[PDB]
Each structure stands twice: as structure tokens, then as C-alpha cells.
């Protein structure tokens, strides 16, 4: 899809191996924020939203938090605290046409900057002057969208690039989109080294009488440490008590 009409594809109940993507030279850009791209198959992801669009190479630097430009301001804005990944690859052989491609557009004018993850596809005539445009183009009345005109002979800075922005919500709620890691059996009333949906620790898992709400996955103590977890396989609430200790 065009950058102004960026497409959003939610994902659910699946497992993925981002190691064959990080090891792939096909992707010209693979940069993650808030989570290391290497250590990815550990933390069982929670929320997942794969946005996708096409820009030109000179604009790839705009797909980053705290950036400005045509794309960042008027087409696709990333929040400052964005936690996710940005992947981009050269799509010259697919999205470039001799004479210029007319299928990919971008928003050229807008009176205010876009909020994070905002999608504007309105085709209202931009009024640059005081006189109101009545749907007709002219002086200070221009069409808001412009075509990239991608050509195979263009410079690599002007060649088409397909960008995919994966956004997450790691370890904050019940996780659906998980990774490809096999589970083990759960042992109660014994000191174990536990890993629940990517949250790790050491402690004794015991039965509890805490009535968690269907949307709540983790509990916390006064110190903000993890107090209890809901078993992802059997919907029961288990308290996590550090492996009994005391001074010697």
C-alpha cells in the first residue's frame, strides 16, 4: 500500500523465527528499539501489529522515533517511546516501472503533523491561501497526494523501498503471538527457575486464592516485582514466592 494509506495487519496465535530474517541480506534495514533484535526468540511476544508501506530510499531515515520530514510529519509518525522493529528492503525490481509508477502515492500537504500511528487518506484539496477551495485546483489550491514515479533507472536513493514496522506491547498482558519455544511441565511447591511468557525468575510456584480478572496476567508486590502468574496452559493463578530464604 501507499505510505499515506499504510496498511496494518494484526497477527494472532502464531510462532515466528526472526533469526532467518536478521540473517537475511535481502533486508536493507533491520533496526529494533526497546528490544534487542538478537535476543528475540526468548520473550514470548504479547501484542503484534505489522504495518506496511512503500517509500523511497531518501525517506527511509524518516521511519524512526523523533524524526521529521514529509513521511514522518504527514504520512506516518512513530511515537518517541516506540517499542518494536523497523525492517526495510529495496523493491526496485517489483515496484519500479519504466516511465514512472503511478500506483504509490504520498501525502504532500497537511496543516498539522500526524499523531503517532495516525492514518490520513482524505483527498480534500489543500487550501494554502485564505480563499477557500471548492474542490477545484488552482492558485493556493493543490491536490494533497503526489506520485513517487518509481523507475528502475532511478538512483538507489530514489528507488522504491518496502518498509514493515512491527509494533508490540511486550510482557504487559496475556500473550497470544508467541515464539517457537517448547514448554515444560509445571512443578508446584518447589524452588524452580521459571519463565512465564518471557518473564524470568527464581521462586516457588504455589496455589493461590487471588481472583484474577480475565484480562490480568501478572501480579506485582509493593517493590514492583512479580508476585504471581497465570499459567498460560491451565487458567489458574499461581503465586510466586521467592525460594524461601533468610540470614545465616
Amino acid at each position, epitope marked *: 500500500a501507499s505510505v499515506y494509506a499504510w496498511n496494518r495487519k494484526r497477527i494472532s496465535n502464531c510462532v515466528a523465527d526472526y533469526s532467518v530474517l536478521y540473517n537475511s541480506a535481502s533486508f536493507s534495514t533491520f533496526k529494533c528499539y526497546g528490544v534487542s533484535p538478537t535476543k528475540l526468540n526468548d520473550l514470548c511476544f504479547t501484542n503484534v501489529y505489522a504495518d506496511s508501506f512503500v517509500i523511497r530510499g531518501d525517506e527511509v531515515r524518516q521511519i524512526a522515533p523523533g524524526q521529521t520530514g514529509k513521511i514522518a510529519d504527514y504520512n506516518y509518525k512513530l511515537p518517541d517511546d516506540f517499542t518494536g522493529c523497523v525492517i526495510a528492503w529495496n523493491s526496485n525490481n517489483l515496484d519500479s516501472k519504466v516511465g514512472g509508477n503511478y500506483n504509490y502515492l504520498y501525502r*504532500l*500537504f497537511r496543516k498539522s503533523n500526524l499523531k503517532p500511528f495516525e492514518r490520513d487518506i482524505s483527498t480534500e484539496i489543500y487550501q494554502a*491561501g*485564505s480563499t477557500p477551495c471548492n474542490g477545484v485546483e488552482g492558485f*493556493n489550491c493543490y*491536490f494533497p497526494l503526489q506520485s513517487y514515479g518509481f523507475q528502475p533507472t532511478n538512483g538507489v536513493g530514489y528507488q522504491p523501498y518496502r518498509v514493515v514496522v512491527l509494533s508490540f506491547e511486550l510482557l504487559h498482558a496475556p500473550a497470544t503471538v508467541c515464539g517457537p519455544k517448547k514448554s515444560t511441565n509445571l512443578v508446584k511447591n518447589k524452588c524452580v527457575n521459571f519463565n512465564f511468557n518471557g518473564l524470568t525468575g527464581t521462586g516457588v510456584l504455589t496455589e493461590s486464592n487471588k481472583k484474577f480478572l480475565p484480562f490480568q496476567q501478572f501480579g506485582r508486590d509493593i517493590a514492583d516485582t512479580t508476585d504471581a502468574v497465570r499459567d498460560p496452559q491451565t487458567l489458574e493463578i499461581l503465586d510466586i514466592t521467592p525460594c524461601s530464604f533468610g540470614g545465616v
Partner: antibody, heavy 122, light 109 residues
Framework: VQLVQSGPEVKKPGTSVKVSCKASGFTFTTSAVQWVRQARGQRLEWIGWIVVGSGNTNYAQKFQERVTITRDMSTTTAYMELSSLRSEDTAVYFC????????????????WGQGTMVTVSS | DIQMTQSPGTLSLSPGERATLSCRASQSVSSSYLAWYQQKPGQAPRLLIYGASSRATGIPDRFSGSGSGTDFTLTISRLEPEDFGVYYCQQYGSSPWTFGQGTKVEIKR
């Protein structure tokens, strides 16, 4: 807020001339640029206009055949190429644009270039 | 195309008098798309009036404008020595944005 044009040009008939027009002060990216010619002792002749952001062009009937108006937002400069020159083309050429901030534009052509004289004969 | 005609050809007036220039369009044009410019010999055009009745930045208040449809008027209340030049009216609503032939305001004698 300036508008600077090319220097004087002296070309043979049948050649091409490319007049430059560089903006300053205002935001070029959201304005438009018109081109006007004036023969020595004659009136003003509207050639055409261009939208800087989009690159769309509109030309006059008498210049549809040998004039092409272009722009380059990277060098904030607009150009006017005039092919197949002849003695009738010997004139002074002005470029005009409304000055604009980051979001709105002026409602007329208030910024004008100094003019570029193009001479052309055998 | 819309034809713009200016009058008079030569305006012979004494410094301090009231000048009046006329601009006629071959068809009715929007008032918000007409401008008046001043150009002196060997100089670039200078915007005087826009929107038919909106003085430009830096233009003295002695310059005024009126009209509607096909006929428009540029009025100079008191003619100053720095005002003797060539005046053009241009419509910029319907393409092509044609110009007038100009009006020379000269010092009478």
C-alpha cells in the same frame, strides 16, 4: 525574502536557454512560480506557472511548443527551458512567487525576480 | 482566453492630482483573483493591490481599488513623483493568467 534570476544570455537561433530562479526567505516547498516575458518596449506576456510541491505545469498557448517549466526543491530553484530560440524570443524574463510560511501562502505574486535578458539573432 | 485591456494608454497628470486607471476583462472574473502591479522602466514588477481591494505590504494607503466582474478601477488619491511608471492588471483565476498592455502615468505639463 529574495528571488534571484540568471544572468544575461546571448544565444544563436535554434538553440535553447535555461533561466534559473532561486527563492529565499519563504518556504519554497509550498508555493508556486509563474514566468512572464517582456519584449523591449512591449507589455507583459504570461508564459505559464508551476506548482512547486507537485510539479504540475500550465503553459500559455503561445509558449506550449517551446517552453518547459521545471523545479528542484532540493536546490530551492525553478527553471524555464526555451528551445528553438529566435529573434522574437529576445526579451526580459521574470519569475514570480507568493511567499509562504510552513503552512500558509500569500494570496498573490508579491515576490519577483530581477529579470534575465535573453538576446537571440543571426 | 480572457483578454485584459488597460486604460488610458498615457495618463498625463500633474504631481498631486488624483489618478484613475481602468481594467476591463473580456468575461466576468472573480474579484478575488485580480491584482495590480507597478513596473518602472528597467525594473521588476511590484505588487500593489490584490484581491481587487486588498493593499499589499508596504504599498501606501493612497492606492485604492474597486470594481466587479469585467470592470475594475485603480485610484491614486494624491499622485506622488515616485508613482510615475507603468501599471498592469492581471487576472489569475482562469488559466491562462493573462496580463494587460500597461498604463503609463506621466507628469503632465
Amino acid at each position: 525574502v529574495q528571488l534571484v534570476q540568471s544572468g544575461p544570455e546571448v544565444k544563436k537561433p535554434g538553440t535553447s536557454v535555461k533561466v534559473s530562479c532561486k527563492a529565499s526567505g519563504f518556504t519554497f516547498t509550498t508555493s508556486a512560480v509563474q514566468w512572464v516575458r517582456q519584449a523591449r518596449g512591449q507589455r507583459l506576456e504570461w508564459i505559464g506557472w508551476i506548482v512547486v510541491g507537485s510539479g504540475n505545469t500550465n503553459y500559455a498557448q503561445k509558449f506550449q511548443e517551446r517552453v518547459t517549466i521545471t523545479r528542484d526543491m532540493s536546490t530551492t530553484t525553478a527553471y524555464m527551458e526555451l528551445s528553438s530560440l529566435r529573434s522574437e524570443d529576445t526579451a526580459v524574463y521574470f519569475c514570480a512567487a507568493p511567499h509562504c510560511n510552513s503552512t500558509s501562502c500569500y494570496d498573490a505574486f508579491d515576490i519577483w525576480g530581477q529579470g534575465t535578458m535573453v538576446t537571440v539573432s543571426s | 482566453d480572457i483578454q485584459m485591456t488597460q486604460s488610458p494608454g498615457t495618463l498625463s497628470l500633474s504631481p498631486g492630482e488624483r489618478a484613475t486607471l481602468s481594467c476591463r476583462a473580456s468575461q466576468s472574473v472573480s474579484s478575488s483573483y485580480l491584482a495590480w502591479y507597478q513596473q518602472k522602466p528597467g525594473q521588476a514588477p511590484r505588487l500593489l493591490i490584490y484581491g481587487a481591494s486588498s493593499r499589499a505590504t508596504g504599498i501606501p494607503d493612497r492606492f485604492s481599488g474597486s470594481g466587479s466582474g469585467t470592470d475594475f478601477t485603480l485610484t491614486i488619491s494624491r499622485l506622488e513623483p515616485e508613482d510615475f511608471g507603468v501599471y498592469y492588471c492581471q487576472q489569475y483565476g482562469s488559466s491562462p493568467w493573462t496580463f494587460g498592455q500597461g498604463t503609463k502615468v506621466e507628469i503632465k505639463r
